[PDB]
Amino acid sequence: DAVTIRTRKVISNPLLARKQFVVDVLHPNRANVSKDELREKLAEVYKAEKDAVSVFGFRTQFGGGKSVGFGLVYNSVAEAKKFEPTYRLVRYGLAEKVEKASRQQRKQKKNRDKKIFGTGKRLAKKVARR
Amino acid sequence: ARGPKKHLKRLAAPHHWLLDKLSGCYAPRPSAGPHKLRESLPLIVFLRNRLKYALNGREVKAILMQRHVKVDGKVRTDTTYPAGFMDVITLDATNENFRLVYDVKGRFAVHRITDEEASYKLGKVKKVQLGKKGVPYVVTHDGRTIRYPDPNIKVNDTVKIDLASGKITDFIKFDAGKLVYVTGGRNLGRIGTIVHKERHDGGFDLVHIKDSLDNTFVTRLNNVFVIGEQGKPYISLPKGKGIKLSIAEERDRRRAQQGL
Amino acid sequence: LDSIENRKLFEGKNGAAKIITIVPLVNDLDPLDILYKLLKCADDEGIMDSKRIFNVHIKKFKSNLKIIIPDMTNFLNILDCAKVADFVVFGLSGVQEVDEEFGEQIIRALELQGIASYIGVISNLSAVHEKEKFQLDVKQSLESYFKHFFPSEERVYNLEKNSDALNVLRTLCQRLPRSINWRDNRGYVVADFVDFVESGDLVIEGTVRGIGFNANRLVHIPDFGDFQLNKIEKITVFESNMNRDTLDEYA
Amino acid sequence: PRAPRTYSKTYSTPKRPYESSRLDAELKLAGEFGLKNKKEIYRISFQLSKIRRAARDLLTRDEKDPKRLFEGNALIRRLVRVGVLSEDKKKLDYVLALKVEDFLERRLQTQVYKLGLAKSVHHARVLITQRHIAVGKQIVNIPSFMVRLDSEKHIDFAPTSPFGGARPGRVARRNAARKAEASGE
Amino acid sequence: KGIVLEKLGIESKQPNSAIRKCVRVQLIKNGKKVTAFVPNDGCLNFVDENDEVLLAGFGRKGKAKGDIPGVRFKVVKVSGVSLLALWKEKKEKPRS
RNA sequence: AUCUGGUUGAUCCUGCCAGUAGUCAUAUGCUUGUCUCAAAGAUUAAGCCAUGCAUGUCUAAGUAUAAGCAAAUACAGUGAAACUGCGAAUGGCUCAUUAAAUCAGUUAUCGUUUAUUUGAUAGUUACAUGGUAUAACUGUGGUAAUUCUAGA
RNA sequence: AUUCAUAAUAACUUUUCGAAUCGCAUGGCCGCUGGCGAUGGUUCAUUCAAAUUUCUGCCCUAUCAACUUUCGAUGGUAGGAUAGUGGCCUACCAUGGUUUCAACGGGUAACGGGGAAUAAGGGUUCGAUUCCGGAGAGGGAGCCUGAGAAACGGCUACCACAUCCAAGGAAGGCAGCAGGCGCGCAAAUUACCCAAUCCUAAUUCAGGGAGGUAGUGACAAUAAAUAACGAUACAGGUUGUAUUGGAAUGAGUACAAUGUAAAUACCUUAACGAGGAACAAUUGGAGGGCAAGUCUGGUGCCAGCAGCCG
């Protein structure tokens, strides 16, 4: 059966160049709808580019048939890319996950460096001579 | 403690902010500034919880650092800057102005004002004295010091201040028959007219107030703020005009009228 | 002061070794795979071979261990090795069920002669993997089984996890064992070396563990019966003073 | 730390344990209404105890005392909404005369039996727990749900079940397949 | 909790006639010496000297209970296993 | 807003023992399928502690010749080390001591200090001065050993 | 309510402060003049605070009736010291101060309060512990820096413990988080993360075992499966007792999507998943108190039962 998408409590927000609203979805006879599908259908209704649309926070009603979530649409792809959190941009494929080392290893490195005064090019020579 | 404290646990926050119990362990501690901690409203609480323009503390900072917000005509960027009673807040995008004023329930209301009224604020006179070289000055409730007041100004009077320049333009004497706004205690947010004042030397003076439904009540002089003549406010009043209703009256109005 | 007094016997590199016996309850297991996984947590590859008794020093805990592996062919030999232990390590299989005619009888018998202390261990739990939640179903079943015989114990360790395997090793080093009443009111030693001298004389050296030895008392060896000793010496010498009793059964 | 979560106990135990006359009266209720426990009866008598306590207090106040008017009317309004109190008895003195059977009568389990749909209170309970009954659009699977007077018109089979119009269940489908396989020899 | 010193039988008070089974125990935390009753008949075979036992009060807030003169406590667990489980044959006891 | 069993040959009393219900009161035994929610080395020892972590910080805007990287002849992007400035007196843990002490409500400073925030506020006394100065850096070293540090 | 605010006169001072600083822009007038900001600085006010302070209020004890004043106890005058009041300290002087309306002494398995349990009403018992206030960092003393500390993830000494060593020396403080030993009736992982709440810094960006997430967890609390319905036979006023038949469903497993910092789980869902529905509910009792056996086998005042009567 047809999915029906409705938007509620629409607020325009010039301070962050976006519109923000509640998303309410009817979907009889299917489990739910993917965030990827919602972003495409919201893009055409608000005349936006797909990369400017962000959608999050869904739960489906007990007994099924309905879901509710939250949505944002930005005035441009450039503005979305600066105000949006990085973790969401990764979900959409607009950014790459950074390869930092684990939290405990980073802390242990810091504490070793605290024991060296200066830049340590000296001392390295001194140990080699010992 | 060995010095000043930097944190504020939730539950210890002022109740009129209407923070929920469970969303976190801490609350925003207001910075030092014009208004006392217990009776200020931090900007983060205004933008996030009242207007809903921001979802997070992180987003609030993204707004302020663009310099979109100014208080009494000056740009502020401290997340916990303490706005307070009678202050003017301006958002230039969206083109909106607000004055912070109390509900009859004793909460800060969202009250919009015209671009004209945003020019000025009222101030209660806290003391008047001679400064160095013999120059007189007044101190207002929000901590401004103004040089060379009119010789007739006395304590408990109210003064009209132009936000540009900062000079005094008018004043109203404390007297019987004036309108007053109540700013503390059990009767916070009510409006009425002065009936008479009780002198108590070495103690607290008491003031008798009557509202337009001719109910009467009493408050300490410390809590009284003069705002105009009988029936002529110097500022726009919030919806409901400071008339207190009994819980029975409130129940009827909602379900009978608005509840259709 | 009493707690120090008691721990002194194992105090350090001069102190006595704790005696560990490994007993796999299933023919599947091979006891040397258990010993291997333990020593990986010692963080010293220098610790880690066609023999069945091992001496080890774990510098990480300043601890001395003696490890005994019995030959699982000989039921009577299993009971003998356990009789001298401080800790018995029981190996359980996640794949194959314990046999009533042999595996159970080991446990039941060891209880009834007395046990100094016990640990339950698994080493092959990955062999049933589909997801880790399927492993935990099996582990809960084994804990219920083991607790039937040793109801003081509520946890069975999985040696395939570094944290568990390290947890076992620490226990063997740091914790004092229970006594065995009938054993410790006698003397006993485990032989380090044995040698013969000519009309015969047999020399043994080791470490005393029980109440102690006296050269006027008789000395039992389980397969050979009673014997008499002529000297004690400390590595002062204590000859048999012969104002003593002798190998006779009457009067 | 975060503020504490509040909670409370919702039932009370009788003080004489083996009183023969009480034991019989309770078992008659369980058989008539299809309950599983004595606890389900203790819950209702605990609620009714608090209602009487509140009303009994207000009746000591003067008439036209503002508190008696405000809180008294709210209490009555609330009991009429669920149909526990008749709209003819709309007075604080009749609140004291309520009894346990008046509350049991309003449970979803018994309503689904009075309406038809089910042929015993025991058949009714199974249907609810197995997700066949809906109240308006919402599926409800709790037997102790109290039916408000407006809701009674809207009790029906759920759209996503057999009896309600969906595909047959797992066992019906299995049988048809196996028969077709044998018939599709 | 205490250590079992020795095993005793106590003659019941008249008019009843029975030899009831008890043990001497030394409490670990005090060194004080106490006599405890062992319930459930043949259960006395499960306790032996230098076993460690957990004791509970005999229900009468420091008075002696029934026939038994001067006995104020009962055994609950021995060597870490409960006597009720042993008596019903639900667990097994290791020796030491 | 409720009680019942036990002193006698039998009775009415005084009186206690036992029974009965709860506990955001702890421990322990037997048993244990589902959803929401949730305390947790206080009691005895404010006893003793292996190992790792829990406090640092830069903007257009104090100091750059890294012999760093990346590509307007005094300099001009990015940026390690070090100097300078601010912070480390908040937070988190525990309950040993303490009986007009701490604490609660209510007062006072005409009896005193106050980084920071906010508002006011100094015509009155060379087209720009020193090293009575040094870190990082370069280079030569001591000690089994530490966030040791010397001479140039 | 003032010897208040403030002003004036004569001097003092080892002489306080009164811009030798930084970014962006490049306008006006015939080499002179100019804008928007950052950081510093004197004094007054304000804000976040601190210190001291008035009145009334506390558990058991007389097998504690007199206590304080040498060596400050109560008060007066002067000085010193302090940010400042005051026996806070010193000199001289006076002889006072508290108490049967319980002083002083002793005990507390005593941190205070908001509060908790049980209540017809009046009461009794508890509060180490999520918020507010106080104290401490093995035990005592002393002190540097600073607006603020008598700081302990700062220093110095002594007392008690205790680590490394080449034996000359060096280093130490988990009543922070996780973890170990001991103790005992008695209490969890040497895991993931700054996404949320907020805090600090020269700061939108860095950091945070504060805090959040998951693991262990029958402390306490809420909802709630373990079966429903026909036919046949027999009995009975539509209800019982036993041969037989189709339907319904989640416990569990799982493609997927959702959830989330990334995950696990909940909510949703294709496929699979009941006939001893083995997909088998326990814990205590059956003389009385106190719901419920004149049943049947065993045993020998013993083994045992028994809160009490037995």
Curated annotation (Swiss-Prot), chain B:
<keyword id="KW-0597">Phosphoprotein</keyword>
<dbReference type="InterPro" id="IPR041982">
    <property type="entry name" value="Ribosomal_eS4_KOW"/>
</dbReference>
<feature type="modified residue" description="Phosphoserine">
    <location>
        <position position="31"/>
    </location>
</feature>
<dbReference type="GO" id="GO:0002181">
    <property type="term" value="P:cytoplasmic translation"/>
</dbReference>
<feature type="modified residue" description="Phosphothreonine">
    <location>
        <position position="114"/>
    </location>
</feature>
<dbReference type="InterPro" id="IPR032277">
    <property type="entry name" value="Ribosomal_eS4_C"/>
</dbReference>
<dbReference type="GO" id="GO:0003735">
    <property type="term" value="F:structural constituent of ribosome"/>
</dbReference>
<comment type="similarity">
    <text>Belongs to the eukaryotic ribosomal protein eS4 family.</text>
</comment>
<keyword id="KW-0694">RNA-binding</keyword>
<dbReference type="InterPro" id="IPR005824">
    <property type="entry name" value="KOW"/>
</dbReference>
<dbReference type="InterPro" id="IPR013843">
    <property type="entry name" value="Ribosomal_eS4_N"/>
</dbReference>
<feature type="cross-link" description="Glycyl lysine isopeptide (Lys-Gly) (interchain with G-Cter in ubiquitin)">
    <location>
        <position position="173"/>
    </location>
</feature>
UniProtKB/Swiss-Prot annotation, chain C:
<protein>
    <recommendedName>
        <fullName>Ribosome biogenesis protein TSR1</fullName>
    </recommendedName>
</protein>
<comment type="similarity">
    <text>Belongs to the TRAFAC class translation factor GTPase superfamily. Bms1-like GTPase family. TSR1 subfamily.</text>
</comment>
<comment type="subunit">
    <text>Interacts with RIO2.</text>
</comment>
<feature type="domain" description="Bms1-type G">
    <location>
        <begin position="16"/>
        <end position="178"/>
    </location>
</feature>
<comment type="function">
    <text>Required for 40S ribosomal subunit synthesis. Required for normal export of the pre-40S particles from the nucleus to the cytoplasm. Its subcellular location and association with pre-40S subunitshifts from mixed cytoplasm/nucleus to all nuclear in RPS19 disruptions, suggesting it acts after the ribosomal protein.</text>
</comment>
Curated annotation (Swiss-Prot), chain D:
<dbReference type="Pfam" id="PF01479">
    <property type="entry name" value="S4"/>
</dbReference>
<keyword id="KW-0694">RNA-binding</keyword>
<dbReference type="InterPro" id="IPR002942">
    <property type="entry name" value="S4_RNA-bd"/>
</dbReference>
<keyword id="KW-0832">Ubl conjugation</keyword>
<dbReference type="GO" id="GO:0042274">
    <property type="term" value="P:ribosomal small subunit biogenesis"/>
</dbReference>
<keyword id="KW-0699">rRNA-binding</keyword>
<dbReference type="GO" id="GO:0003735">
    <property type="term" value="F:structural constituent of ribosome"/>
</dbReference>
<keyword id="KW-0539">Nucleus</keyword>
<keyword id="KW-0690">Ribosome biogenesis</keyword>
<keyword id="KW-0689">Ribosomal protein</keyword>
<keyword id="KW-0687">Ribonucleoprotein</keyword>
<keyword id="KW-0963">Cytoplasm</keyword>
UniProtKB/Swiss-Prot annotation, chain E:
<dbReference type="GO" id="GO:0006412">
    <property type="term" value="P:translation"/>
</dbReference>
<keyword id="KW-0832">Ubl conjugation</keyword>
<keyword id="KW-1017">Isopeptide bond</keyword>
<comment type="function">
    <text>Component of the ribosome, a large ribonucleoprotein complex responsible for the synthesis of proteins in the cell. The small ribosomal subunit (SSU) binds messenger RNAs (mRNAs) and translates the encoded message by selecting cognate aminoacyl-transfer RNA (tRNA) molecules. The large subunit (LSU) contains the ribosomal catalytic site termed the peptidyl transferase center (PTC), which catalyzes the formation of peptide bonds, thereby polymerizing the amino acids delivered by tRNAs into a polypeptide chain.</text>
</comment>
<dbReference type="GO" id="GO:0006450">
    <property type="term" value="P:regulation of translational fidelity"/>
</dbReference>
<dbReference type="GO" id="GO:1990145">
    <property type="term" value="P:maintenance of translational fidelity"/>
</dbReference>
<keyword id="KW-0689">Ribosomal protein</keyword>
<dbReference type="GO" id="GO:0022627">
    <property type="term" value="C:cytosolic small ribosomal subunit"/>
</dbReference>
<feature type="modified residue" description="3,4-dihydroxyproline">
    <location>
        <position position="15"/>
    </location>
</feature>
<keyword id="KW-0963">Cytoplasm</keyword>
<dbReference type="GO" id="GO:0003735">
    <property type="term" value="F:structural constituent of ribosome"/>
</dbReference>
<feature type="cross-link" description="Glycyl lysine isopeptide (Lys-Gly) (interchain with G-Cter in ubiquitin)">
    <location>
        <position position="7"/>
    </location>
</feature>
